[PDB]
Amino acid sequence: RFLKVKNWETDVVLTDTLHLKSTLETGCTEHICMGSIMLPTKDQLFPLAKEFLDQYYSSIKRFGSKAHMDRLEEVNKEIESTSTYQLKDTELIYGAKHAWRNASRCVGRIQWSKLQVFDARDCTTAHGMFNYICNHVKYATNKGNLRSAITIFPQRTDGKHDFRVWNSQLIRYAGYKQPDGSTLGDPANVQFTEICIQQGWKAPRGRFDVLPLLLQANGNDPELFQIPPELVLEVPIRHPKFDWFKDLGLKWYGLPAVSNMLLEIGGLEFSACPFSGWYMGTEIGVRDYCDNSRYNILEEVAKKMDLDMRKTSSLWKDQALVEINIAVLYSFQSDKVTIVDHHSATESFIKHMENEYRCRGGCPADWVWIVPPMSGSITPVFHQEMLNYRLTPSFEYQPDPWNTHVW
Template sequence: MRIEVVAADRRNVAGPTVPTTEQLAWAARVAWANADRGIGRLRWRGLHVRDLRGVTDPDAVASGLAEHLRVATRDGRIRSVATVLDPGVEILNDQLVGYAGYRQADGTILGDPRHIELTTLALRAGWPGGRPVDGGRLLPGPFDVLPLLLRVHEGPVIAYELSPERVLEVNLEHPGYAWFAELGLRWYAVPALSRHRLHFTDTLAYPVAFSGFYVAFEMACRELADQNRYNALPMIARCLGREGSRPEGFGLQEAARVLHQAILHSFGRAGMVPPTASARLEIYHRYLPRRKPGPRPVYRPIDVPPPAGAVAVTADSAYHGRRRLEAAV
C-alpha cells in the first residue's frame, strides 16, 4: 500500500517526490535497520523521528537540535531519536555534543584531540571557550562542551552554546578506588551523530541528527582510552601502581578494566546503565533471525567490539570474519 501511494505521488507531482512526515519517519527507521553498523538496531521500529524540514532560521534550528537532546535524554531514560533537517541546513559538528580540544603553546593538547579544528572554528565564530569557574570566569579545561556550529544556505557559521540542562554529563568515580573521582574524568550520556544524510530517493536527501545510546566499551576503549583521544589509561595505571608492569601492556589492560568498571558504576548511579558489549551483542544476535535474507554490509569493529569477542555469541556465528552478512529488510 505504501509503495502504491508513493507511486501515485510520482505520477501526479512534477519533480522529485516530497515525502510526508509519516513516509519520512518510515524511511528513517528502515535506514537504521539496514545500516552497516550499530548493534541497537533491534529497536529500529521504536526510533522517534522529528521532522524539521522547512525550518531554516538558524535560531530555530539550534532550538530544535537542543530539543532533540532533551527528547533523547529524558532524565536518563535514553531513547533513540532522529531529527530530519532542511536540505539548506548544515551542522559542522560531528556530534551534537562534543568536547573542545585546545592546542597549547608547548604543543600539547588540552581536551579532545579529535576536535582541534572544530574548536578553532568555534572560537572564530565567537565562542569564548572554557567553562565558568570562580564566580563566572571562563577557564579552558579538558571537558568543555562545544557549541553547535550551524550554517544555513551557505551563510556564515553561527555558534550556539548548549545549556547545561540539555547536556547530561556523568562524573566518573570507582566503587573501589576513592582517588578515581579526583582524576576529573567525565562523559556525556547521548551520542548524537550530526553529519549523516537520510537518502529518501536517489535525488532527495536530508541532513539528519541521529542519537542512540552508548555501550560502555565505547567510552572505556575509545573516547577516554584511545591514545589519539584522551589517553587516560597511563594515568589510571600510575594511580594503580601498575605503570611499567610486565608482561608489556599488563598495566594498561588493568587500567582499561578499572575504567570500564567506573563507567558502569557512575552511569548506574546516575540512573543510566550503559549495556555491556556482550549483553548488547546477545540482543543483536536475537535480532538477526528476524531479518529477511539478502546481502547487507556489516562493520565488524562495531558489531564485535574488542572486549566482547571471546564471550559474545556473535563472534562464533556463521558470518564470523565476513564483510557482508545475510540480513536485509
C-alpha cells in the same frame, strides 16, 4: 546468491537472501577485500523513488494496490515538474527507521523500530535549527532515561542550499593545542574547536568544555549557539572500589548523537539529520578514554593501580582497561543514565540477527565494527560470520562542510 553464515560457537547456520536486493557498492572486489577501510538529474531520481516506494507499499501489505500506483504516478509528476519531490510523513518515518535498520555498523539495531522521528522539514534558519535541536536533546535525554530519536531538516535541492550541523555529534568536548606541546581536552576536535573560536566562540579553555553548535541553514553561513547547559546531562566518573578514581576528574556526557551524517531516502538526500540513542560502555571507556589519539588515560590509571609498567607482558594496559570500563558502567548506572555493556549489547544483536534472518532474509553487518574494541572473543558476535552489504534507505558519511562550504 543464497549465501550462508555460520556461528562457530553454536553451529547455528543462517541463509541470507536479503543481499541480492543490495544496491550500493562496498569497496571490495573478488581481488581485494577492503573490509577494514574506514571510508571506501531527473533521470536518476524516479527509479530511486520507485525503488523506495515499492518497498514501503510492500511493508504495509499494499503492494500493487490502487493507493500504491497513485503515489508512484504523483511522485513521477512532481519530479518531472520540480526536479525533486516530497515524502509523506509516514514514508519519512519508515525511511528513517529503515536507514537505522540498514546501518551494518550499528550493534544497537534490535531497537530500530523504536525511533522517534522529528520532522523538521519546515525549518528555514539556523535559529530554527537550534530550537529543533534543543527539543531533540531534551526529548531524547529524558532525565537519564534515554530515548532514540532523529530530527530531519530539509532535503538537498540545488546543492548549495544545504542544511548542515557542522559538529560531528551534538554534544562533544573542546580541544586546544597548547604552548606546552600536549593537547588539552579532546584531541579529536582541535580542528573544529579552532573554527568555532574563529567564528567568535569564547572558549573557557578546560579539559571538558561542551562545544557550541555551529548551524548552517539553506546553504547560508554557519552560526554559533550554546546548548542550554541545563540540557546537557553529564556523568562524573567514579569507581565502585577504587576510591581514588574520581580524582582523575573524569566526566562524560550521557547522550550520543551523531550529527554529521547524511540520510538518503528514496533518492532524496537529508544532509542534516542528527540522531541519538544511548551508549555502549566500551565507546567511552575503551575509545574516548584510552585511545592514544584521545584522552589517553591508561598510563595515569595504571600508575595509581600500582601495576608493573616495566614490560608489556604484565598486561598492565589490559588490567587498567577493564577497571576503567567498570567505572564508566558503574557511574552511569548509579546516576540512572541509560547505558548498555558490550556483553548485553552483542547478545542483543545476535537475537536481532536471528530475527532479521527469519523475518527479512538477512541482516547486513560489518564485523570490524560490530565486535567491541575489548573482550571480542568472549562476546558472541566474535564467533558470528556476517555479510556486509549496502541497502537503501541508509545513513552515509559526508565531507566536513568546511572542506566544501563557500563562505
